[PDB]
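Illustration: D-aminoacylase.
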Amino acid sequence: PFDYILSGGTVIDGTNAPGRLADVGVRGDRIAAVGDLSASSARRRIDVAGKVVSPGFIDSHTHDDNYLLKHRDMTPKISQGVTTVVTGNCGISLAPLAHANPPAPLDLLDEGGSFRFARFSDYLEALRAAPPAVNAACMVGHSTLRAAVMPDLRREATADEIQAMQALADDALASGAIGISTGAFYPPAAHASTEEIIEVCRPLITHGGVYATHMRDEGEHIVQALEETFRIGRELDVPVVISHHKVMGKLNFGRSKETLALIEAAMASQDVSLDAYPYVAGSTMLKQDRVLLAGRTLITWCKPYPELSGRDLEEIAAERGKSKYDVVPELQPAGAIYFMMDEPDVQRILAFGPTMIGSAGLPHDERPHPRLWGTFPRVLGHYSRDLGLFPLETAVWKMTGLTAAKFGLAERGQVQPGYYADLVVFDPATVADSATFEHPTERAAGIHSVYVNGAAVWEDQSFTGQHAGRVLNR
Ligand SMILES: [Zn+2]
Ligand SMILES: [Zn+2]
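Result:
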């Protein structure tokens, strides 16, 4: 007898196929059967008529490393239908590094002395001992490795440092990390050479992990950063994941046509994947960058002047008698939201076949970018249903089946008998992102319930208390 059967709904199984009327039976942490299950005994038959039952959403791009430990309910994600998170992106992982004041953007994961895990394995052990509501697929970050090894970061690593970083990278993979990420765009790794990155990431082929990257540049020199990424993939011979793809700055609007053709061509000869969030504004550390600071900029938090949270940077700069660019140093460390992308490029990137969905949410931010709470429903409702950017089954595939395949999360991402029961029940007609820039923490509409490994984690718009998540390995 099944524990429960979700009956009367439409299943969108994650294989990019139109939905079909069918029930879904669960037994323990597995999907037992799918189809007309009226003849199967079950302890509960949950009416989900009018709803869609799909695989739980896998957030391909998170910075939930620390949040998973500090807020095990993971409300920002489970209230959106997310059942699994990929952590340690853009070269930023919580472990391995014991440091009381890590260099930005590492501070985006910190709540005060959070960087206390000396070994990557200590971090994973802490997650297993006190599981979060979602599953976690963790990567180790190259910038974190740099901060842990190099006394001085504004230079290339020596052979000995490279040996030290590679050793850490290898232990992490050995412990269960699913890959290694980089973020040469940022200060901690701006002086890292392509060869340093390659040497440090060689353990990837031995352990079979992926190389994920916040490319060195995403504007004027994006072709060069793309070629560097492709080159790295060829030298390591592992799959590469291009993080939050975009063309930023007015001088680059419209160039998504050019970038997607380069990526498409590369996919024909080597293993390449990419993800993106559905918004025209980005968000990270406050940084002296001519392009990031060209348009509207909002402060998400600020250490020296906390009362600046939520304020427009132009106003702050003007009142301090400077350009946004010049006022940045005296406000650091801080976080910001940057409106530097164009809707047409974002739509093109999202619609591009292989693009997976990733939030890039920054959960510790005082006044966060709404992507943290609205990413997935925004794709399902606004883009798929309201704008018809793709049919619902394809939008679902982009956050379930596709993603599970690229990160190698076996037996998840599909509503198939024998697979784990990570599931979402949503209303296709009302599902929507409620979070806005003005109110970035509003709970999404149309998400009925969410199950992780067969246990309901979200019901009646509330965390159930089930710490059902598991640390996953690729
Ligand atoms: Zn990121
Ligand atoms: Zn990034």
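Reading the tokens back as a structure: The chain is about 30% helix and 20% strand.
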